[PDB]
Symmetry: C2
């Protein structure tokens, strides 16, 4: 039993039971150890999720604009990888640092560069958080909304929101 072996069953197990379902006992059970053994690889449910989150991102995660774009898209992908995958991400260094330079090398007031990182990430995050709950969960205007909304999903909505964000980043830069 290495730590890899734990984190990955954790992810399978996630798929089966959901984030509320995912207990250290249930994990111990699947892996066929006893609960205590697990603590050699994980502090507790918190530290474990934080580990699961990372792995998701490892696995499923040039101009500046088309950095932001490709960063999010991958994040977004990474989140939808698993049940309740966004909820996991919610509650959780070098890659950070690079980014904020690679941003400031294109004339970005660090502060702003942060807020750019943040805006995209938070949005990507909200979108998926929401694709994932509608899972768990008329007048005439609405219905086509809905039916076009259904025909398509959220990927358009995702991208179209990703797009305004970038647009406004061009504008708040020229200043």
């Amino acid at each position: 039993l290495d730590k890899s072996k734990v984190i990955n069953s954790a992810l399978e197990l996630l798929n089966e039971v959901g984030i509320e379902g995912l207990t250290t006992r249930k994990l111990a059970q699947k892996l066929g150890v006893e609960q205590p053994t697990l603590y050699w690889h994980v502090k507790n449910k918190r530290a474990l999720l934080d580990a699961m989150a990372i792995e998701m991102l490892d696995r499923h995660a040039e101009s500046w604009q088309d950095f932001l774009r490709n960063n999010a898209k991958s994040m977004r992908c990474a989140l939808l990888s698993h049940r309740d995958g966004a909820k996991v991400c919610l509650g959780t260094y070098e890659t950070a640092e690079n980014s904020l330079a690679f941003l400031c090398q294109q004339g970005f007031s660090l502060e702003h560069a942060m807020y750019a990182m943040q805006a995209a990430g938070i949005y990507t995050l909200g979108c998926v958080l929401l694709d994932q709950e509608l899972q768990v969960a008329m007048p005439p205007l609405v219905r086509q909304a809905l039916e076009l909304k259904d025909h398509q999903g959220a990927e358009p909505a995702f991208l179209f929101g990703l797009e305004l964000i970038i647009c406004g980043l061009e504008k708040q830069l020229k200043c």
Copy 2:
């Protein structure tokens, strides 16, 4: 015991116990009825949250841009009104319809008008969802991020993200 009386204790109770803590039993207890009585006013925990959510929005919730702005800000306010207030909103008609016209009266392809509603709402939502978890939850670039981030909070980040969104809405309109 009217229904108002239930929903409001529910909100107090929320503050005390959090969303995971908020059981129908715990509510029955506070109100000093028995569990069954509550079902006369609420189907179950789901229908109850859906009710709590509404009330929050009732209570704490011109150009088009400055509709989107003022809509979100109020939503955002409304969410931070209570513990886990965004998590409640997550899992949950006329006001809808108006909006989508009031949008199309300014030359907005319904579809887009939807995606505009959506983008702002989802972002507002992600932001607060995140103000609320950091509650529940270095190289040098980062630290000032952090320290400026701490000095200020998220309200700047909120607005600055709200702002790009609107910017990009002006651009995706001129087309």
